[PDB]
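thread from #wetlab-drylab

HS: before we spend reagent money on co-crystallization trials with 5,6,7,8-tetrahydrobiopterin, can we at least see a predicted complex? here's what I'd submit
DV: go for it
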Amino acid sequence: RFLKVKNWETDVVLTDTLHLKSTLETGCTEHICMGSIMLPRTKDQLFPLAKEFLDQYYSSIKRFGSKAHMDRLEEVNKEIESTSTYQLKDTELIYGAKHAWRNASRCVGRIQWSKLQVFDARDCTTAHGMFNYICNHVKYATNKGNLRSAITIFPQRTDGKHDFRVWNSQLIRYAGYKQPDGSTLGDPANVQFTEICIQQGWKAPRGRFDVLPLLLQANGNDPELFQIPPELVLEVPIRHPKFDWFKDLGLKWYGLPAVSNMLLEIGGLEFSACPFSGWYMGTEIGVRDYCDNSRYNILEEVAKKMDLDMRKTSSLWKDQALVEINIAVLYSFQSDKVTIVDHHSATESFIKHMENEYRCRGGCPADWVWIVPPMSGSITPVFHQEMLNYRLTPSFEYQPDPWNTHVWKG
Amino acid sequence: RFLKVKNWETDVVLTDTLHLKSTLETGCTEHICMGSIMLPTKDQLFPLAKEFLDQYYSSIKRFGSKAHMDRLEEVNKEIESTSTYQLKDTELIYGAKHAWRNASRCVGRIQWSKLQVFDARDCTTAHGMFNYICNHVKYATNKGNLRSAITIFPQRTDGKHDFRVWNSQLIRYAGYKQPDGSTLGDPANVQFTEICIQQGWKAPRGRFDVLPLLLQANGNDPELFQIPPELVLEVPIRHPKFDWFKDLGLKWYGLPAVSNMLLEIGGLEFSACPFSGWYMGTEIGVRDYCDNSRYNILEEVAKKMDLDMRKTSSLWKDQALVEINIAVLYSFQSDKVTIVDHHSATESFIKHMENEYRCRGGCPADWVWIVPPMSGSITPVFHQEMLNYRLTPSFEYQPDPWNTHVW
Ligand code: HEM
Ligand code: HEM
Ligand SMILES: Cc1cc(N)nc(-c2ccc(CNCCc3cccc(F)c3)cc2)c1
Ligand SMILES: Cc1cc(N)nc(-c2ccc(CNCCc3cccc(F)c3)cc2)c1
Ligand SMILES: C[C@H](O)[C@H](O)[C@H]1CNc2nc(N)[nH]c(=O)c2N1
Ligand SMILES: C[C@H](O)[C@H](O)[C@H]1CNc2nc(N)[nH]c(=O)c2N1
Ligand SMILES: [Zn+2]
């Protein structure tokens, strides 16, 4: 089967065949679309998953059907039979992590997918060991502001009772503190996690931008607290190129976006701790982190200081302040030589990437709802681009927050 | 099978049961989501008629009544006899209002029960169509105090006698390809404009020429008619801060009136059903003015603003986009022509969704279309999960008539 997608700005039509390789389900049916819903192993099932992956790996290196390919299938089959699991070769792990990124339909940054530094941490055994690996990742990826994409991969799941987990949602994130008066100091997104850290013994500074400690679980054991060395945490004070009062808002953000709570699936194996990092698209900070009502919520204060007419929404004071904040974020990162991409550049690159994938790969699964930036949607080319969303493996998946599932040793 | 939608800004969860009544297909499967794709005999008719009258009689608290059964029987008798049936006025009004209620791509549905229905089923000629349409335009315009309206022409019979308005909207601007390869006016309308010229229209070849109506009655060849200029309310666009903005020479029309969709009620098909409301500002300011394939004015505006256009990261496009949208809203408000901003419209839609969940068990909504084309996440709908599904009565797309018409 062939499915076509059209771009309504350019009339370019693309043809998707890659969707034929999807196995996992979307949530939709012929009767309902769940496109805007945020969240819609015995040996038995494992060998087919391993075989499908190894077939893809061997095809990619142009060795499909070779003796090396056949011997590797045989080796994995026997390993599964006798140990109930198997270990990936370093080459397969690298290929697999790159492809999980390539396959991430919610990621606008995938033009970069083949440039990913993979740190193999499968020899790690303790939370202190994880801490060391994570510091090294942060220092490597940060590279004094010249950000480099990277992923660190801790040991895979065995019986599900010995999981490695980073309890942080991102490696670098700001604390949030609910006050007795119902207001929040710092990042309201992180209140629950901040409370857990405090309970575990963290001495909270109780400021507006306190970098959270790492809370690290090795081998199914109770998690342990570590402070990332402050000298490894690059931050950017936010100022505006024209508005000199902007700096006195006291805003800053960190340079390194590093997701630490997803699960990486390769060949049926599950890597429950696989922190990965890239660089920011400006709107992530300037639109969502700063301007969501449920986050730092700065629109009002910004608009006030700009002296916009705030008595009617139709003055578009919110839209005006939003643009100025996003200018400030890009200006500040660029002035400090910390890698960042604006939403125009990022989406234009994504379209070129998507066209290339259709041509070379037969498709590019993409989730329009997430790919379109949260401001200025239709002045970016992705708004006008039809997309097809489906699930390919290797993949990054959500997993339940570990405080909800962890069995405490005490 | 009972489904939850969450709002991620407010944590409010709603449960949807209405989707279980859904009839048509979405385009998606369990393997692939097509959420972002724009266009994804006698035997069929009685089940369709029944499903509709059932919901109608239920709505008036007379389900299972003598009058309900009598009506089912009468329509059944009529389909058996004539292979079609005629809706009572009450059913037609109910059906039109519900097609709007069911339109998953419409953010303005809080208004759904306030719709003036003009029954034009007695219309026989294209001149009669013209008269009905001028009356609709004048009623809906109401000197700038806009009122939602639909005019319903005769239903499809054998399909070779269709009523069609050939225009995509009752009021739209012409587009002309230039000798030098550029486009004057609205590029969206080039093909239709050529059909008008081919049919005889004398075009002024300007940037904002209101198109003539091309009206097809009873499957006959369509005819040209010009809407009395005095019935076409237009708004010159100026900015409350930038005095040079008026020098751009921009205007738009006050009345958004879709004329190329098909209304389906109880299996009957109304191929000419022009309907109108009032604009949300972004429709004009973001899409009509700033789409690359539309008037595409961003560059000229940015230049007049003296912005640094050398780098995307200056956000000059974004800055200019906001200023255009400020001017659109200011100009309509200053001339007392009803308009809604995207903040107000989306706030209203959330309230409407809440009403619908509470009173009806759901509200089909297409997120990709409901979220405004600028400032997405600062509107509440961005954070609102929506379920998309197709209920009837409905408005549907239909093929452009020129590809289908036998001359
Ligand atoms: C190189 C620069 C990159 C940029 C600019 C970028 C951009 C983004 C953005 C803006 C999002 C949406 C985040 C949100 O709204 O919550 C995202 C999602 C994602 N990206 Fe990237 N990305 C980059 C690199 C990476 C890398 C290195 C990986 C993994 C190896 C990755 C995998 C993902 C995944 C899995 C998601 C989905 C996250 C979720 O569902 O919460 N991306 N990307
Ligand atoms: C009262 C003021 C109204 C507002 C502010 C409003 C708002 C909108 C907007 C912004 C769109 C999207 C248009 C686009 O992006 O191309 C839309 C779509 C639509 N609305 Fe409305 N609406 C209104 C009244 C109505 C009425 C009276 C009807 C029918 C009786 C209607 C039925 C529809 C339908 C069927 C669509 C989908 C059109 C398509 O798919 O091309 N709406 N609405
Ligand atoms: C590697 C990378 C680069 C970049 N620019 N951004 C990201 C990134 C940032 C934040 C997030 C978090 N996304 C929200 C997660 C979430 C939260 C609540 C419900 C959901 F379904 C999902 C994911 C990826 C990751
Ligand atoms: C009654 C009403 C009020 C209002 N504020 N806006 C509208 C409205 C405006 C424009 C349109 C046209 N929609 C785009 C049609 C289209 C064009 C090309 C491909 C597609 F899938 C769809 C529909 C409804 C209609
Ligand atoms: C309900 C809705 O799906 C939700 O708010 C989504 C919309 N699009 C998004 N897009 C991105 N990139 N990130 C997000 O968190 C969201 N949130
Ligand atoms: C491809 C994509 O579905 C398309 O550009 C859509 C996106 N959302 C939209 N939303 C509205 N309201 N109107 C539109 O025309 C579109 N176009
Ligand atoms: Zn879908």
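DV: The first strand of chain B starts at residue 3 and ends at 6.
HS: ok that's useful, forwarding to the group
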